[PDB]
Amino acid sequence: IADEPVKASLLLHVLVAHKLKKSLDSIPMSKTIKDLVGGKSTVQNEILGDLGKEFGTTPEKPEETPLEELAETFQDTFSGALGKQSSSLLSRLISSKMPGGFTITVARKYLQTRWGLPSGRQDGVLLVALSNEPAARLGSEADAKAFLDSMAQKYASIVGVDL
Amino acid sequence: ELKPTVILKLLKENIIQMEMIENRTMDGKPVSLPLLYNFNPDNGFAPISEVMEDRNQRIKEMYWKLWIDEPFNLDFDPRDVIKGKDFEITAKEVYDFTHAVGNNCEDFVSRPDRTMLAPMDFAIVVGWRAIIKAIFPNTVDGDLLKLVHLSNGYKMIPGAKPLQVGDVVSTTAVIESVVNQPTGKIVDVVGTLSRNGKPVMEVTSSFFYRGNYTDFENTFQKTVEPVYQMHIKTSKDIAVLRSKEWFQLDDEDFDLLNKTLTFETETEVTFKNANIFSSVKCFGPIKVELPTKETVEIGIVDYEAGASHGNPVVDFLKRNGSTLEQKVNLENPIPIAVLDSYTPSTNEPYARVSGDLNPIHVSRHFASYANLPGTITHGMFSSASVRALIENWAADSVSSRVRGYTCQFVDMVLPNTALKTSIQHVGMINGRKLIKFETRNEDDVVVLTGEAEIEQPVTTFVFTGQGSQEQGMGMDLYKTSKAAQDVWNRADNHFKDTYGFSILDIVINNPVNLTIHFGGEKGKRIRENYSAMIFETIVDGKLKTEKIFKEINEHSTSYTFRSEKGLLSATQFTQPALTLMEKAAFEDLKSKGLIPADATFAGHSLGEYAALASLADVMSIESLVEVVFYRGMTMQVAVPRDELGRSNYGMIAINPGRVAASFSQEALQYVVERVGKRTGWLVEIVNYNVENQQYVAAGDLRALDTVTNVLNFIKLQKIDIIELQKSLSLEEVEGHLFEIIDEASKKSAVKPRPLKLERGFACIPLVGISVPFHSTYLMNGVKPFKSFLKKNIIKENVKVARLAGKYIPNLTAKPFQVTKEYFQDVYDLTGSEPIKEIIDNWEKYEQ
Amino acid sequence: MKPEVEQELAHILLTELLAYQFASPVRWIETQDVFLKDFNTERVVEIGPSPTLAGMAQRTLKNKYESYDAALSLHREILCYSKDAKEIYYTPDP
Numbered sequence A: 001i002a003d004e005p006v007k008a009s010l011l012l013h014v015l016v017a018h019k020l021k022k023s024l025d026s027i028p029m030s031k032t033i034k035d036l037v038g039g040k041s042t043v044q045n046e047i048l049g050d051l052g053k054e055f056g057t058t059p060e061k062p063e064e065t066p067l068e069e070l071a072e073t074f075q076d077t078f079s080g081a082l083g084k085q086s087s088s089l090l091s092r093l094i095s096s097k098m099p100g101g102f103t104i105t106v107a108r109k110y111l112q113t114r115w116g117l118p119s120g121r122q123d124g125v126l127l128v129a130l131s132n133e134p135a136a137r138l139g140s141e142a143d144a145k146a147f148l149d150s151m152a153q154k155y156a157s158i159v160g161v162d163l
Numbered sequence B: 001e002l003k004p005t006v007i008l009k010l011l012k013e014n015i016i017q018m019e020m021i022e023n024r025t026m027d028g029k030p031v032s033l034p035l036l037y038n039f040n041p042d043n044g045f046a047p048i049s050e051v052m053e054d055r056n057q058r059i060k061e062m063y064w065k066l067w068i069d070e071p072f073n074l075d076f077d078p079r080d081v082i083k084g085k086d087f088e089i090t091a092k093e094v095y096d097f098t099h100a101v102g103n104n105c106e107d108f109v110s111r112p113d114r115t116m117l118a119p120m121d122f123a124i125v126v127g128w129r130a131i132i133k134a135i136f137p138n139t140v141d142g143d144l145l146k147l148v149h150l151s152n153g154y155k156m157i158p159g160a161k162p163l164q165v166g167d168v169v170s171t172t173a174v175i176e177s178v179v180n181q182p183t184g185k186i187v188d189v190v191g192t193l194s195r196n197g198k199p200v201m202e203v204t205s206s207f208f209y210r211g212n213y214t215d216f217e218n219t220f221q222k223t224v225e226p227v228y229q230m231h232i233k234t235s236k237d238i239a240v241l242r243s244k245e246w247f248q249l250d251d252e253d254f255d256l257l258n259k260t261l262t263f264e265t266e267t268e269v270t271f272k273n274a275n276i277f278s279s280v281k282c283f284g285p286i287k288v289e290l291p292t293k294e295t296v297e298i299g300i301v302d303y304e305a306g307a308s309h310g311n312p313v314v315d316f317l318k319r320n321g322s323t324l325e326q327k328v329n330l331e332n333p334i335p336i337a338v339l340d341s342y343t344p345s346t347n348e349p350y351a352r353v354s355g356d357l358n359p360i361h362v363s364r365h366f367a368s369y370a371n372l373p374g375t376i377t378h379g380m381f382s383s384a385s386v387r388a389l390i391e392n393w394a395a396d397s398v399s400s401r402v403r404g405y406t407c408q409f410v411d412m413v414l415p416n417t418a419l420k421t422s423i424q425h426v427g428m429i430n431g432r433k434l435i436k437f438e439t440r441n442e443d444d445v446v447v448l449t450g451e452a453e454i455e456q457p458v459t460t461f462v463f464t465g466q467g468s469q470e471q472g473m474g475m476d477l478y479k480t481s482k483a484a485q486d487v488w489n490r491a492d493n494h495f496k497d498t499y500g501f502s503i504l505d506i507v508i509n510n511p512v513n514l515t516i517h518f519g520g521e522k523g524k525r526i527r528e529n530y531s532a533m534i535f536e537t538i539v540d541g542k543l544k545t546e547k548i549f550k551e552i553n554e555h556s557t558s559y560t561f562r563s564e565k566g567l568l569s570a571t572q573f574t575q576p577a578l579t580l581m582e583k584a585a586f587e588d589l590k591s592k593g594l595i596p597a598d599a600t601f602a603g604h605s606l607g608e609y610a611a612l613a614s615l616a617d618v619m620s621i622e623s624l625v626e627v628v629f630y631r632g633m634t635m636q637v638a639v640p641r642d643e644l645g646r647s648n649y650g651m652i653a654i655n656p657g658r659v660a661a662s663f664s665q666e667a668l669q670y671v672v673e674r675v676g677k678r679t680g681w682l683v684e685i686v687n688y689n690v691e692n693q694q695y696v697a698a699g700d701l702r703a704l705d706t707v708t709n710v711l712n713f714i715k716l717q718k719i720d721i722i723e724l725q726k727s728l729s730l731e732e733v734e735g736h737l738f739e740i741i742d743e744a745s746k747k748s749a750v751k752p753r754p755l756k757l758e759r760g761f762a763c764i765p766l767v768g769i770s771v772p773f774h775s776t777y778l779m780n781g782v783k784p785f786k787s788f789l790k791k792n793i794i795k796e797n798v799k800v801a802r803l804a805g806k807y808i809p810n811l812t813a814k815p816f817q818v819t820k821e822y823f824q825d826v827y828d829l830t831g832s833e834p835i836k837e838i839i840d841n842w843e844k845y846e847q
Numbered sequence C: 001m002k003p004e005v006e007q008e009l010a011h012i013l014l015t016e017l018l019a020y021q022f023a024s025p026v027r028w029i030e031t032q033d034v035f036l037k038d039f040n041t042e043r044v045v046e047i048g049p050s051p052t053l054a055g056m057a058q059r060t061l062k063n064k065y066e067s068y069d070a071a072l073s074l075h076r077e078i079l080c081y082s083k084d085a086k087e088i089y090y091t092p093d094p
């Protein structure tokens, strides 16, 4: 279908939701890093080190400033590349939560064929599947397709896609 | 070139002599073995018979010339210590050895400004002329053609540095054991390499003469037994041990009840036949666990016997005791690498360098005569080659990290063979990684098993101070681990019996009020333990001993601890909780064998106690939790509090980097000094953490709420302090800044006494802390606290070995040394009379 | 110095080290500079409930040892006991 490069807004919201192990909707985009995390010292440097390695550069005081305008300033320089660790989080999701054979290139080919979604849209689907990661591995292959039958409408609900 | 190898002729009329010649010898001159054969023409079917008399001595005589630089004498006792001659190590011998084995590790290559080390395999080069002299004696009679090397092993002695170039290494060798099996005779040798008197490393070697030996009068076997533990819970177990003649205590009435005994035994058997020992002589020290987990010799074993069918010491210890295994296996083996290596085309280079000129690895005829499949590769080459793969992959091409290495020579390898070695990190032992390996040939047949002991990369342990202490800490570990269980239980028992509360309860469910009742015999005893606690502090060179718990007296029937959110945040319970949790964690790590024998350690503020108890075992658990509680409780009284458990003192985590990049820690030290002098109240820097990024200043909450507002004004107006004392009005600015301090002095004074500190720009106030720890304020309570430790830290528990170099005090951030210069450094920054006395009287202690 | 005399002096030094430490500033900068530069530690295992001293090391390494760590090409692992159990215990995920 119609291709679209990934933004810095869904990546920033997903990475924080994955770090806190909470749903995307539970965390508001409006609030800042320090209010959401609540005091706990070590995690601020982990999130800043995260926003330092994917996006390459970070603002002067990113911790206090809200996330909506951090997505604003990251989209300015953003090229559409998911990130080294964002692909590393998808490397451990595929290897540890999908069964013996359901690799990244078959979960690539399923969304491409069944749905039609191209690489720019499938990259957006994979990030929403990370912040809705299952607790254990899905033993059956048909549950690794019924899981990927769920994250196509959630991507569509968030961004806006007809499937 | 073409040389004569065999010369078959007639020595006599009926004695066929097959001279077999080795042309690769020490001094060029070829060595002949004259094999004889009776020729009888009457027995036309088998006219040739071997002359079996004096056969093994002819063979030995050959191998003596091939291996030993001494006169041929097979008359010496195997029991006696064989003395190899001093070996001088040279850069050419190491160069030739490393190329001969393919060990391309930069440690063994001549680089500029960096002295060449010799591989630990080079020990068999030094020791071979002694170790192999152990299978020559007449009493260890065998056919050397059929000789098999079963297993070779090295073990560096703890501390001793690896071999260098220019080191004159002495060698000793001794036969540990020589036992006739059904299928042949095993000879276990234990060479010792020594440098400047000090022993450097042990070499173990097992040889196997295949055949049928029944010379049991010459055999023996000095086994070292696995350490056996015992728990003497009952008085039946004391009586059973008292029955045994061999259980000889130094003290006859020593109380064994609720004690742990270890039995470090070594046996010395001599055989009469295969299955009957002619003299059993099991002995060794009997050690008791102290409350610091240190072991002390209290007795001995002294079992002696004649004819026997077993060791009744070992049998008894097995049934009525548990083995201490030092090798703890990981949950799953970790694959490291799978590697391919090739045996060389010819064995001549390894024979030249090592000095192992055994013909079977060079001469086709000798190998053919010994029924081998061709000129086999030196097993000692395969060993060295695999050890160089282990060194490169397991020890990340560092030599010094390989502290042991064994290998069993399962099967023979022919030249031009391609070997696959699988390397696995399977276990730990005393902080050294335990790496098994397995080498196969192209037929997928195991040819070389073995394991290496590999040091962990240089480790330091740091122990956290009174930061966060959230409830249920260490309780996930206390459910699983057995050493953490033992730690918490011990402390919780000591706390319940002494002060009538459970620390475990407090950590688990963090109650808000905890009431101690002093009803009953136990009650009065606990109430005495509470009243005994005092707050000895010095004022004007005069003791003002206030008693902690002033309300607790002869008539009091209770006492209640108060909090706001929970008693785990009160100092007197935070500190013992935190210390225990650390100690438990460590004790789990030590049970798993993950603790380097030479790891440095430090502890931040409180951690220092946990650290010293963990690494140095200088205190018992009971003595630890006594001290850390008493100090915690002394800090609840060292500041005037209110009726909930809160004071007008605390700490701020200043980040001078955040206010201004120019604002170095000198300008931070300047401003805090000036705010303290002005408002009169306490301000002082207490923790130098991260440079120009995190300092901690403790003092009077009002005086610390002025500093966080003084440094929230400099940021907003970007006004420097160094650029005013350097490039502007010099020294005057100390009067200017007094207005900025006096601005916040009349908003902080107005504020209540339990005022909450507001997270500023470059200052965050800490949580849990209400006392100015590490400040001068509580310097007075040091002279009587010194005396309190003196009856808790008993000098019999202070091992200097376990502190010297590794411990880094917070007082004097410098590895702990018992050198005068370290004492001089301590005194010069902490004026102590006993330290000054030790400095002035330093000479007499030397003697 | 005899072992039984060295024991006594060490027991004095240790006593009058803890006594003052109580009430004298913590010099944890110099401490890090010892065990990070002097000893060239690789694994820095922090024992405690949260990574506070791990955080302090990691920040000291970036501030004043990044060019020193690059030059001598040594890979300083910082493990807290709370969050890095699997690297300390050698229990990786299959």
Ligand SMILES: *P(=O)(O)OCC(C)(C)[C@@H](O)C(=O)NCCC(=O)NCCS
Binding pocket: A041, A042, A043, A044, A045, B465, B466, B467, B605, B653, B687, B689, B694, B696, B764, B766, B773, B774, C052, C055, C056
């Ligand atoms: P986090 O490391 O991102 O937050 C910074 C911190 C200042 C809160 C943190 O490093 C910390 O808790 N430091 C305090 C250590 C200390 O000295 N405590 C007082 C013992 S007297």
